[PDB]
Design an enzyme around this catalytic site. Structure first.
Site, PDB file in Angstrom:
ATOM      1  CE  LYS A 127      -3.250  -2.361   3.062  1.00  0.00           C
ATOM      2  NZ  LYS A 127      -3.911  -2.235   4.387  1.00  0.00           N
ATOM      3  CD  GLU A 173       1.504   6.387   9.709  1.00  0.00           C
ATOM      4  OE1 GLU A 173       1.916   7.120  10.631  1.00  0.00           O
ATOM      5  OE2 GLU A 173       0.329   6.404   9.292  1.00  0.00           O
ATOM      6  NE  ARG A 174       7.512  -0.026   8.385  1.00  0.00           N
ATOM      7  CZ  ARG A 174       6.488  -0.790   8.031  1.00  0.00           C
ATOM      8  NH1 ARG A 174       5.940  -1.646   8.878  1.00  0.00           N
ATOM      9  NH2 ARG A 174       6.001  -0.691   6.798  1.00  0.00           N
TER      10      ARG A 174
HETATM   11  N1  LIG Z   1       5.633  -2.180  -8.438  1.00  0.00           N
HETATM   12  C1  LIG Z   1       6.517  -2.782  -7.637  1.00  0.00           C
HETATM   13  N2  LIG Z   1       7.719  -3.126  -8.151  1.00  0.00           N
HETATM   14  C2  LIG Z   1       8.610  -3.726  -7.357  1.00  0.00           C
HETATM   15  N3  LIG Z   1       8.491  -4.060  -6.070  1.00  0.00           N
HETATM   16  C3  LIG Z   1       7.294  -3.709  -5.589  1.00  0.00           C
HETATM   17  C4  LIG Z   1       6.273  -3.082  -6.285  1.00  0.00           C
HETATM   18  N4  LIG Z   1       5.175  -2.875  -5.463  1.00  0.00           N
HETATM   19  C5  LIG Z   1       5.553  -3.373  -4.311  1.00  0.00           C
HETATM   20  N5  LIG Z   1       6.820  -3.894  -4.314  1.00  0.00           N
HETATM   21  C6  LIG Z   1       7.522  -4.513  -3.198  1.00  0.00           C
HETATM   22  O1  LIG Z   1       6.559  -4.941  -2.249  1.00  0.00           O
HETATM   23  C7  LIG Z   1       6.898  -4.445  -0.936  1.00  0.00           C
HETATM   24  C8  LIG Z   1       5.968  -3.318  -0.573  1.00  0.00           C
HETATM   25  O2  LIG Z   1       6.458  -2.669   0.617  1.00  0.00           O
HETATM   26  P1  LIG Z   1       5.600  -1.576   1.365  1.00  0.00           P
HETATM   27  O3  LIG Z   1       6.392  -0.860   2.384  1.00  0.00           O
HETATM   28  O4  LIG Z   1       4.942  -0.679   0.317  1.00  0.00           O
HETATM   29  O5  LIG Z   1       4.443  -2.433   2.022  1.00  0.00           O
HETATM   30  P2  LIG Z   1       2.935  -2.192   2.468  1.00  0.00           P
HETATM   31  O6  LIG Z   1       2.143  -3.440   2.089  1.00  0.00           O
HETATM   32  O7  LIG Z   1       2.423  -0.911   1.945  1.00  0.00           O
HETATM   33  O8  LIG Z   1       3.061  -2.177   4.045  1.00  0.00           O
HETATM   34  P3  LIG Z   1       2.227  -2.592   5.335  1.00  0.00           P
HETATM   35  O9  LIG Z   1       2.453  -4.028   5.662  1.00  0.00           O
HETATM   36  O10 LIG Z   1       2.698  -1.628   6.424  1.00  0.00           O
HETATM   37  O11 LIG Z   1       0.775  -2.267   4.974  1.00  0.00           O
HETATM   38  C9  LIG Z   1       8.370  -4.064  -1.029  1.00  0.00           C
HETATM   39  O12 LIG Z   1       9.204  -5.192  -0.790  1.00  0.00           O
HETATM   40  C10 LIG Z   1       8.487  -3.571  -2.471  1.00  0.00           C
HETATM   41  O13 LIG Z   1       9.807  -3.728  -2.975  1.00  0.00           O
HETATM   42 MG   LIG Z   2       2.884  -0.340   4.807  1.00  0.00          MG
END
Ligand SMILES: Nc1ncnc2c1ncn2[C@@H]1O[C@H](COP(=O)(O)OP(=O)(O)OP(=O)(O)O)[C@@H](O)[C@H]1O
Ligand SMILES: [Mg+2]
Ligand SMILES: Nc1ncnc2c1ncn2[C@@H]1O[C@H](COP(=O)(O)OP(=O)(O)OP(=O)(O)O)[C@@H](O)[C@H]1O
Ligand SMILES: [Mg+2]
Lengths: 50, 464, 99, 47, 50, 505, 120, 69
Positions: free
Chosen positions: B159, B185-186
């Site tokens: 996200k 958030e961190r």
């Molecule tokens: N389009 C993309 N291309 C490459 N890697 C991606 C892409 N979208 C996401 N990722 C990978 O997926 C992960 C997403 O990390 P992120 O911090 O955005 O997690 P989040 O799901 O938003 O966090 P949370 O668990 O706090 O909700 C990372 O490892 C990132 O490298």
């Molecule tokens: Mg996140």
């Protein structure tokens, strides 16, 4: 009286649901951040009407 | 007017007052800690009465170090925050004290953080369409100005990357004052965001305030109110459109639950507060575009244990207009913009607002995807052999069209080491109509994985 | 002749405004009315609105005029009643709902 | 000869569905019983 | 006296009203509709279900 | 009458309290006019108590250690000191209980101050980016998902897989860094064991004794035979000891053996106090507890001294189900994870690391430029190999188009296996990665490749070692070193013999 | 306690036999619920790990003498993720299986080599 | 099953702490006191005998229920 409308000093209206031995429970309808201990409560002598 | 502390447990503090004077609800109180190593002052807020001139209060700071007999003084006012023109360009805490430059302020306007939503006669619906370079969001669930955007998803399904990409696109494309907030958030993410905004030369007009994990729940439940108060001030007086960003609203709900168990109220289903709908409603209705002011927001919401049945997102589902959803299986497949096309829905999509061709294309895509999902049950054991060719063609078309939704957004520049892309919606609808015609079945599947446009599509297909 | 009444519980005000706009465009606003209980209000109004609507309809029903009633949501009223009952220290029942 | 391997792979793929469904059923049963006991104890203690 | 079931799968299938004729039913029956409708239309739900 | 009450309140030789309740390690004591939240109470039996609650007339308290020494009528004496643990620079090389008493029996210990178990934490403006490599002896983790200083990394895996093996390997590998006298390269190690059998603790301690690296290692133990208090407090004491060296300018690596046991103990303690439960009897405080425990670890800013702590939590799950309360909460709070599953371990490969799930949010600054240059596109190639292997029973589609791909997949799968108690350095591991990627070992049969490289490795250690120094100094792979290395490989493999005696060509 | 006295007074190695472990946890849960405590985690006592560890911690060998034991555990509802077997298996080293098909073959040990393993 | 239900009703009406499935803790003990009376005797006491055939009813082909186990 059971389910009888009651008046409050701030202009809000209340309803008495259950009647205990020494206390009466009431629910507030409108804004309720202007309610404090020591106010005055009056009975309107009438059941909820529209 | 002198108070005495009688009982303390957890972050909740009892207090008694003289019979003559008792402060009303939501009035700040001040207390002190006399311990040498942990000297600190604490601010308390009135929660409820108990009779006998007793009051229950919630501590704004960790309660370690307190002792009975401590005097308590009141201010006779609600919690106040500073507002002004020059606020943008600095980091703030829950209480409003500056962090980069301590002591700055105390000369601007001061407003409370307990207000009322606007009257009914000032309400008005809006239908101005907003477009984004992304193809999946524009083709299926277009965004509408003046409303709300929701990004539902699980844990660790990217996200934050989508939020960063969208805010970067908006900031580059459009100006206006912007406000960013956050709960749960961190700190590493906060520092990275600060560095990125410093580099981008856009932090000057962006207001920043946020809490973190390691805080008592009071700050976690009040930083959002402070952020809304500041946003409303920027909305009303200046008469300027404002972008608003909030991350991980679900944490707020969790905070409330905790204090409920401390207050002693009867628990509800799945151990939640007896009342949770009212708080969510009064928080959500604070955001509303009036006739003379346009406000566009975006809320990211967490889902606990990957179970949609919990009331935490269920209650929020009713206060939204544009919704996008994320799934674990789609992420496991490999495509990074793991957005469920079947579950996602919007309210602006209609032939009255948009041309008929877009409506027809969306309907056909939905039908094909739904039929493939229906066939998934049979195909998972035997395979494609048992099915007839009249469904083999649909299976191949569905595979290719679903693989085409992948894209390489610029927010992955630090991961994939490749630049981003932009696609106007006319090219998107033309390409999708061509694909739904079925001409492109000759090309291999793996060509469509992480592709930008149809020209790049053809180049990659012919280069292999 | 048919007279209709619309009741809304726990919905955003902008949705009510859009429904009003649709009715205005349809021109039916001559012979219809709306009772609004937005989510920003307390639990009392949410718990009480449908009875008011029913009484309003019943007054015309006694006079001999046909009346149409539409309830938007009904689970929200049950949730509000559950919250009120739990706050009033009444013992709970199955699925935390009052008996 | 081509026919035989299809049936072999079909059985091999069919076993894992049984395994996964068994795991899901056990998880659901545990969740249901723990929810019921939590609710009944909470109701009993309130009086 | 009667209910109508609406499923999302039918809605995405292509049926815009998306009512499920298999379960939806009305207790009053054909007495409500006009006589011409019952003459022209009758026992259609059985045909659809079968 | 108000004045009399005020004077009564203000009137208040040493304060003494009496015990009124007991059972299940909970006490109720009253009669102490001077109270203090979370103060250590000394009971006459030598046991200790902590005040987690406070009422008008009495105060409740939880007990630590042995709890059968409680009887009604006992007299308890307060202590004005807030809960704390003695901390000093002589703690290394010892084994202590959570309260700090030396349990090893080697001798007595001395400290200098007593830091509190709960204090403030660094803010946003007091942090910095991550730009330091934390090398590990395991080549798989440093080749797939690197780890840098000041970044928390999660290890989740089912029972009987060998997480403690990885932790012990890292602790052993830190010896080379400890050898030099440079403060910047210095690293300390703290291990925390929770709810573990005594035999396992003795075995790991004796393994470290064989390793001979106690000069920088501190072990805190909370054995399963003890009560709930130690099982709940021990990680906090470990974190406090780590933070004391944080705030002086030293690099620290901390390992938590388990976190599920602490959550279970906290659930038991909470349920014993009649608090209403939540999901799966877990109260709403679990997320707060874990967030507070894990948020203390972060790299400090440049001005304050630039200390760093790297945390290694370990989590076990049953029947490889990621969908659960505690695993989801912990994977949400932390960043990055490593997945260990029983399928590959049962198949025969000892280091069981999956390739499609283990994704680390660490930036590229963790890996050295040479490491990034030599190794690339490994994860995608392994994922596509794991996708292709499912069709190994149908060769009518491949037809000498992906045969080289299958050969490369087999060689790479056989290359990454690692023996037990064999830490590895950066030089030989980057050499092995280069040799594997360049495909020079395509001729060698799979049944012996391992031994071959080992021989080659030691041969390069016997021959000139100028290439190692060159790529160690500039941190990049110079070309002339590349031609020298390939020439050495050619010369060695011309004279090399296979298992069956067939020379590679 | 009797076995410990034998071991620590005579110096002779001893073997301990236990018929079931499920009934032990059953009795623990019953005595927990009669004292009017609060149940948790699928109708179990809140501290089962404490009693289980306190019982199992007095089996290890020390001072040159060994106390080897053998147990037979019962799995309820054919579930291996139930809390009681999950806690019991944490202190296990070797597992042995017996069946009827091997007995139908007609051999004495009647142990299936494909279902037994050890951690050493 | 009927006897267990009656005992549960009496125990709940007498305001005793409940447990899993709204059953008192001692319920198992109850059955152990009743069904264990029958057993073969030795020739010293006359060599009497007694045989019991309890009957249990289960629902939905389910065996994991409390009383059946
Ligand atoms: N389009 C993309 N291309 C490459 N890697 C991606 C892409 N979208 C996401 N990722 C990978 O997926 C992960 C997403 O990390 P992120 O911090 O955005 O997690 P989040 O799901 O938003 O966090 P949370 O668990 O706090 O909700 C990372 O490892 C990132 O490298
Ligand atoms: Mg996140
Ligand atoms: N490289 C290796 N070569 C051989 N055996 C190995 C290797 N790595 C691990 N093992 C085996 O794994 C086990 C070591 O792990 P350990 O027994 O500590 O269990 P664990 O998976 O960490 O879990 P737990 O703490 O529940 O016991 C031993 O059985 C050891 O033989
Ligand atoms: Mg182990």
């Amino acid at each position: 009286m059971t389910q009888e409308l009651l008046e409050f000093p701030g202009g809000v209206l209340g309803v008495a649901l259950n009647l205990d031995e020494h206390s009466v429970g009431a629910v507030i309808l409108g804004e309720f951040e202007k309610i404090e201990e020591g106010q005055q409560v009056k009975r309107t002598g009438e059941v909820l009407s529209v | 007017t002198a108070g005495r502390v009688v009982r303390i447990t957890g972050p909740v503090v009892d207090v008694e007052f003289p019979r003559g004077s008792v402060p009303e609800l939501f009035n700040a109180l001040h207390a002190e800690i006399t311990f040498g190593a942990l000297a600190k002052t604490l601010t308390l807020e009135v929660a409820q009465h108990l009779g006998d001139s007793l009051v229950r209060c919630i501590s704004m700071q960790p309660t370690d170090g307190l002792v009975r007999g401590v005097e308590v003084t009141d201010t006779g006012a609600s919690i106040s925050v500073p507002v002004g023109d020059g606020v943008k360009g600095h980091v703030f805490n829950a209480l409003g004290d500056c962090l980069d430059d301590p002591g700055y302020g105390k000369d601007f306007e001061h407003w409370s953080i307990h207000r009322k939503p606007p009257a009914f006669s000032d309400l008005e619906p809006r239908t101005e369409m907003l477009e984004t370079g992304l193809k999946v969001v524009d083709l299926l669930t277009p965004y509408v100005r003046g409303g709300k955007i929701a990004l539902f998803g699980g844990a660790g399904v990217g996200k934050t990357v989508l939020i960063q990409e969208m805010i970067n696109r908006i900031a580059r494309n459009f100006g206006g004052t912007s406000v960013f907030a956050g709960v749960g958030e961190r700190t590493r993410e906060g520092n990275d965001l600060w560095v990125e905004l410093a580099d981008a030369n856009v932090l000057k007009d962006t207001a920043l305030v946020f809490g973190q994990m390691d805080e008592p729940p009071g700050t976690r439940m009040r930083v959002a109110l402070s952020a809304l108060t500041m946003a409303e001030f920027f909305r009303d007086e200046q008469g300027q459109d404002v972008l608003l960003f909030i991350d991980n609203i679900f944490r707020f709900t969790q905070a409330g639950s905790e204090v409920s168990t401390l207050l002693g109220r009867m628990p509800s289903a799945v151990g939640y507060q007896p009342t949770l709908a009212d708080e969510m409603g009064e928080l959500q209705e604070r955001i509303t575009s009036t006739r003379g002011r346009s406000i566009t927001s975006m809320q990211a919401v967490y889902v606990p244990a990957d179970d949609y049945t919990d009331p935490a997102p269920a209650t929020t589902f009713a206060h939204l207009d544009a919704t996008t959803e994320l799934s674990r299986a789609v992420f496991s497949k490999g495509i990074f913009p793991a957005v469920d096309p079947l579950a996602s829905s919007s309210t602006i999509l209609d032939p009255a607002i948009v041309g008929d061709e877009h409506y027809r294309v969306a309907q056909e895509v939905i039908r094909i995807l739904q039929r493939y999902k229906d066939l998934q049950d049979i195909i998972a054991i035997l395979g494609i052999d048992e099915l007839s060719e009249e469904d083999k063609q649909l299976v191949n078309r569905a595979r290719r069209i679903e693989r085409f939704l992948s894209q390489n957004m610029m927010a992955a520049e630090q991961f994939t080491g490749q630049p981003g892309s932009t696609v106007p919606l006319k090219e998107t609808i033309e390409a999708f109509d061509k694909l739904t015609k079925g001409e492109f079945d000759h090309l291999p599947e793996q060509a469509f994985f992480l592709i930008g446009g149809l020209d790049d599509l053809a180049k990659k297909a012919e280069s292999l | 002749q048919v007279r209709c009444v619309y009741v809304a519980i726990g919905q955003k005000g902008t949705t009510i405004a859009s429904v009003k706009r649709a009715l205005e465009e349809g021109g039916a606003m001559e012979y219809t009315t709306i009772v609004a209980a937005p989510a920003s209000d307390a639990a009392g109004f949410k718990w009480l609105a449908p009875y008011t609507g029913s009484a309003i309809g019943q007054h015309w029903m006694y006079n001999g005029k046909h009346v149409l009633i539409v309830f938007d949501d009904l689970s929200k009223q049950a949730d509000a009643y559950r919250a009120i009952s739990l706050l009033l220290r009444r013992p709970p029942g199955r699925e935390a709902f009052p008996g | 000869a081509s026919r035989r391997r299809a049936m072999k792979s079909a059985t091999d793929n069919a076993d894992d569905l049984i395994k996964a469904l068994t795991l899901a059923a056990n998880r659901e049963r545990q969740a249901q019983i723990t929810q019921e006991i939590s609710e009944i104890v909470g109701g009993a203690n309130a009086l | 006296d009667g209910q109508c079931f609406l499923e999302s799968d039918l809605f995405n299938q292509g049926v815009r009203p998306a009512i499920n004729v298999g379960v939806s039913v009305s207790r009053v029956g054909g007495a409500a509709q006009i006589k011409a409708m019952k003459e022209v239309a009758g026992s259609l739900r059985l045909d659809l279900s079968q | 009458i108000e004045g009399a009450i005020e004077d009564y309140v203000s009137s208040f030789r040493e304060e003494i309290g009496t015990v009124i309740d007991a059972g299940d390690g909970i006490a109720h004591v009253e009669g102490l006019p001077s109270v203090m939240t979370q103060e250590l109470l000394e009971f006459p039996g030598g046991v200790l108590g902590v005040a987690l609650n406070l009422d008008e007339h009495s105060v409740g308290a939880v007990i630590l250690g042995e709890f059968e020494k409680i009887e009604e009528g006992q007299q308890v004496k307060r202590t004005g000191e807030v809960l704390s643990v003695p901390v000093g620079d002589a703690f290394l090389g010892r084994v202590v209980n959570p309260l700090g008493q030396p349990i090893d029996g080697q001798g007595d210990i001395a400290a200098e101050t007593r830091r509190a178990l709960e204090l403030q934490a660094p803010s946003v403006v007091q942090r910095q980016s991550v730009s330091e490599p934390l090398q590990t002896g395991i080549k798989a983790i440093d080749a797939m998902t690197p780890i840098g200083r000041g970044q928390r990394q999660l290890i989740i895996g089912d029972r009987k897989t060998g997480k403690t093996a990885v932790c012990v390997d890292t602790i052993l590998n830190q010896r080379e860094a400890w050898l030099t006298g440079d403060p910047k390269q210095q690293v300390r190690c703290v291990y925390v064991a929770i709810g573990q059998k005594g035999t396992t603790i003795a075995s790991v301690k004796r393994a470290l004794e064989e390793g001979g690296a106690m000069e920088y290692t501190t072990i805190v133990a909370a054995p399963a035979s003890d009560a709930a208090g130690f099982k709940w407090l021990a990680p906090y004491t470990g974190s406090a000891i780590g933070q004391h060296w944080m705030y002086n300018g030293k690099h620290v690596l901390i390992v938590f053996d388990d976190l599920s046991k602490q959550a279970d103990a906290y659930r038991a303690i909470s349920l014993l106090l009649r608090r209403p439960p939540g999901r799966e009897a877990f109260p709403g405080d679990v997320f707060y507890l874990h967030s507070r425990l894990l948020e203390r670890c972060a790299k400090l800013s440049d001005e304050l001294g630039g200390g760093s702590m790297t945390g290694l939590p370990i989590i076990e799950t049953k029947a490889n189900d990621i969908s659960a309360f505690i695993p989801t909460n912990v994977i949400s709070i932390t960043d990055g994870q490593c997945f260990l599953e029983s399928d590959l371990f049962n198949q025969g490969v000892r280091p069981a690391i999956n390739v499609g799930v283990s994704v680390s949010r660490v930036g590229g600054a963790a890996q050295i430029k040479a490491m990034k240059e030599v190794a690339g596109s490994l994860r995608l190639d392994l994922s596509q190999y794991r996708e292709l292997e499912a069709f190994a029973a149908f060769a009518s589609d491949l037809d000498a188009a992906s045969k080289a791909q299958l050969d490369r997949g087999a060689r790479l799968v056989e290359l990454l296996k690692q023996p037990q108690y064999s830490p590895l350095a950066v030089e030989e591991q980057v050499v092995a990665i280069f040799l594997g990627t360049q495909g020079h070992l395509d001729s060698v049969p799979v049944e012996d490749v391992q031994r071959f490289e080992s021989e080659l490795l030691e041969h390069v250690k016997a021959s000139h070692s100028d290439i190692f120094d060159g790529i160690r100094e500039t941190k990049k792979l110079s070309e002339e070193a590349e031609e020298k290395l390939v020439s050495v490989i050619n010369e060695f493999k011309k004279g090399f013999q296979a298992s069956d005696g067939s020379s590679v060509v």
